[PDB]
Design an enzyme around this catalytic site. Structure first.
Site, PDB file in Angstrom:
ATOM      1  N   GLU A 187       0.886  -1.179   0.000  1.00 39.59           N
ATOM      2  CA  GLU A 187       0.000   0.000   0.000  1.00 39.59           C
ATOM      3  C   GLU A 187       0.916   1.220   0.000  1.00 39.59           C
ATOM      4  O   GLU A 187       1.486   1.562   1.039  1.00 39.59           O
ATOM      5  CB  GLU A 187      -0.918  -0.024   1.221  1.00 39.59           C
ATOM      6  CG  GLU A 187      -1.838  -1.255   1.321  1.00 39.59           C
ATOM      7  CD  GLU A 187      -3.224  -1.039   0.682  1.00 39.59           C
ATOM      8  OE1 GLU A 187      -3.518   0.111   0.302  1.00 39.59           O
ATOM      9  OE2 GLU A 187      -4.025  -2.026   0.537  1.00 39.59           O
ATOM     10  N   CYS A 194      -2.686   9.010   2.860  1.00 39.77           N
ATOM     11  CA  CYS A 194      -2.250   8.418   1.611  1.00 39.77           C
ATOM     12  C   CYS A 194      -3.204   8.739   0.452  1.00 39.77           C
ATOM     13  O   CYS A 194      -2.793   8.689  -0.709  1.00 39.77           O
ATOM     14  CB  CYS A 194      -2.084   6.888   1.797  1.00 39.77           C
ATOM     15  SG  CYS A 194      -3.641   6.053   2.149  1.00 39.77           S
TER      16      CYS A 194
END
Lengths: 470, 470
Positions: free
Chosen positions: B212, B246
């Site tokens: 990720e 993010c």
């Protein structure tokens, strides 16, 4: 430079593609089908010569019809796979109109590295899933089947523009350069040791990988199994391609009291399948001298280390050795540090290990690396369930060997040292798609009224705390 | 060795679990829930102090309740995910009784490496899917949130035996040893550059990875969008954690004629959210002085290269600087070689790029790396569809930002440089499971009587040739 230029041309075309409609994917798949139908005689002849005598009947089944079946299934089924999937959205905003879904989109340009044991299937069966997902692709056939590699290259050049589907041929130097390109996804079938290097190369560009690798696939023979039936099915599967299959039975576990009877039945079946070995065009040769010496070195090492080696299905001969055509050698309970205990055989030899209690065999399997396939023969459902629950393998066949990779609507792939990722069916469509979650806002945002935005309301904080519950 | 001894202890216990029933997985998830419920105030205090003043309200909502919601969803939903799935079997053998199915089994021991910006969520939300799949796990909290890492370690040690769930803490040296262990699966959240090194480390043991990672998440503002509504939603999502998310909006694309109206609206909203900046406990500091200097240097470097920089939401002050609390800086049309054009901001600055035709913005997005998130604001359904069809991102929000990772029943993860793999929902369950295909033979094997076995006759060959069709 030339390989990168080809990837860039496919990528340029993909970025102009935008959406890839169902019917365009089906037309691409149909074109691959039409190509193979037109060229299959040339392709079977190439495969025969590359092996030094591989039966065209076996090639037609395994590589031609196997590939066509994958391609047709993807063609006919992909309309069921492309629609977006609505999902519950984020509560409590869904009470104000927020919605959500997953949509599937192609990743882009996929490289596919095939292997030599099934040199069409390991290209065109993954391609079926790759094209169903809407990608463009480049194929790298194995240099150990160079006639087949060249026939595939000529056939694709005759049917496809290089921006849609292309073929790169060359030695392992070309393969290495192939693996280092910044694909959107890379598929590789081959050995576990090479797969590690593929993944290292892919890591340099964060390329996701489907790695179909190796291991020693075990067969567990229930002490209650029909031994004659098990011997027939195992003989047919192991003799296929002279053991040169990624799911070939490599180790058979049998109860000590039944070992002799099993070998006798295995020998009877094998001699009926192959009444002669030397000069028998039904016997697939070991592909080349390198791999022939490899397999034979495992047998000789086992014998030097004191393991009993049995001949099953015929006798060796000068002529058979010269043709790389051999009867089955069965090595009994080889020592754990022997070569044949530590390497995938991938050829006309088999390990036969005995047990007293089936959990002893399961424990040995679990102490090793996880195999691509695991097999169980028997009629005791409780025992079958126990074996599967206490093992892990890429896939399984029950009361047969080598059959589950022919499932069109189930994934085919490994786990652990036998690989990662999968192709075939919807799972293979998903493998070469990006599953893209989408949240869509509603009309009215209640956050401001509820005190959820800074400066935060005290009531809001009170409600957050009341939400911390078991 | 200590780290390996712990992995080996978890692996030994996993091999003894055999099958892992639904209720054991639910009990494990419930124990994690109970641990967080019992300790959440101490955890929020640790997170506040690690950042030098991160709002306990933001931590409660995002790290505590976000983690709890993932765990409860997995607990409540997993009985829907674990049943085996029958599948069509292999024709023609399914006409003779053959059957097939896919069964899901845990992979074993999973390592989870979290990050500092959401130091509970990036451990416990992936953990929810990991435990739902029947695995055991080891957690590595970020050392940039050291009080939180220590509090997590003590909480887990009070609630769990280390053979079931354990925590390892330490700096980059520990992180490197962690990535080098032979996990059955490794989850890593962090920068793209470190993800590359993680994937390189994993390749040595053929460890499958969920990565990720990062990128520059763009917002496309349709020229038909409600600009005030978009400014409000973007201000709220960009100011969350002061941009240290993010999926934070990093680049906003706006028609040249609308840039001024948009920036004015963004300023008005931001000033309403944060009437003061210095001393305002609602403003999350940049986590430490290193990242503060990083973000500020991107702003400075862009202005030095001629990019206009606008103040949004207030005026910088000496006190604000010392607290690492800043208004938003909007950098207009920075040159492609500027640091802020080439790096993920992850803080209180935003790039605003103008376009004359929306496809210009898409083309630029497509010329960079694929972002973890992409956002579109507008009301034109056809334009929305065109944008999504001609781009690729991990996930998307439409008419909002930062919302789609909160979907419990849709995957969360990246594509390309923003990562590979996913967690949340059934997709997350499948991520940490092996999907094991099983073929089960029928009673009667028809191959021999149909001539499908060696010695191969001509009639069988003729039937094979007749099957080669379009």
């Amino acid at each position: 430079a030339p390989l990168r230029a080809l990837l860039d041309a496919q990528r340029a075309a993909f970025l102009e593609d935008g959406g890839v409609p169902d019917t365009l994917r089906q037309a691409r798949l149909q074109r691959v089908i039409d190509m193979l139908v037109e060229h299959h005689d040339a392709l079977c002849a190439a495969m025969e010569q590359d092996f030094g005598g591989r039966s065209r009947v076996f090639s037609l089944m395994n590589d031609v019809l196997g590939s066509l079946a994958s391609l047709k299934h993807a063609r006919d089924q992909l309309p069921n796979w492309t629609p977006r999937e609505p999902r519950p959205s984020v509560a409590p905003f869904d009470s104000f109109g927020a919605t959500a879904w997953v949509q599937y989109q192609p990743k882009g340009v996929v490289g596919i590295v095939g292997t030599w044991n099934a040199p069409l299937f390991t290209l065109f069966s993954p391609l079926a899933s790759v094209l169903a997902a809407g990608n463009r692709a480049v194929l790298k056939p194995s240099e150990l089947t160079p006639r087949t590699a060249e026939a595939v290259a000529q056939a694709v050049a005759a049917f496809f523009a290089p921006e849609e589907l292309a073929v790169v041929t060359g030695g392992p130097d070309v393969g290495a350069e192939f693996a280092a390109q910044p694909w959107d996804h890379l598929v590789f079938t081959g050995s576990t040791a090479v797969g590690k290097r593929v993944m290292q190369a892919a890591a340099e560009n964060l390329v996701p990988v489907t790695l179909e690798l190796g291991g020693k696939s075990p067969v567990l023979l229930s002490p209650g199994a029909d031994l004659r039936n098990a011997a027939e099915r195992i003989a047919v599967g192991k003799s296929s391609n002279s053991g040169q299959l990624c799911v070939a039975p490599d180790v058979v576990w049998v109860h000590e009291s039944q070992a002799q009877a099993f070998v006798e039945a295995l020998d009877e079946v094998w001699r009926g399948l192959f009444p002669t070995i030397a000069g028998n065009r039904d016997v697939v040769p070991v592909v080349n001298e390198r791999h022939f010496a490899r397999v034979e070195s495992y047998v000789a090492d086992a014998a030097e280390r004191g393991a009993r080696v049995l001949l099953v299905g015929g006798w060796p001969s000068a002529q058979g050795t010269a043709e790389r055509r051999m009867p089955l050698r069965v090595v009994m309970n080889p020592p754990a540090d022997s070569e044949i205990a530590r390497h995938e055989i991938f050829g006309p030899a088999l390990v036969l290990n005995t047990f007293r209690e089936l959990p002893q065999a399961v424990a040995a399997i679990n102490a090793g690396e996880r195999p691509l396939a695991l097999y169980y023969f028997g009629s005791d459902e409780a025992e079958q369930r126990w074996v599967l629950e206490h093992t892990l393998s890429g896939g399984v066949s029950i009361n047969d060997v080598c059959m589950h990779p022919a499932l069109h609507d189930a994934p085919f792939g490994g786990i652990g040292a036998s690989g990662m990722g999968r192709y075939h069916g919807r799972e293979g469509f998903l493998e070469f798609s990006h599953a893209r979650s989408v949240y869509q806002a509603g009309s009215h945002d209640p956050r401001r009224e509820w005190g959820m935005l800074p400066p935060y309301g005290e009531q809001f904080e009170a409600m957050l705390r009341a939400s911390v519950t078991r």
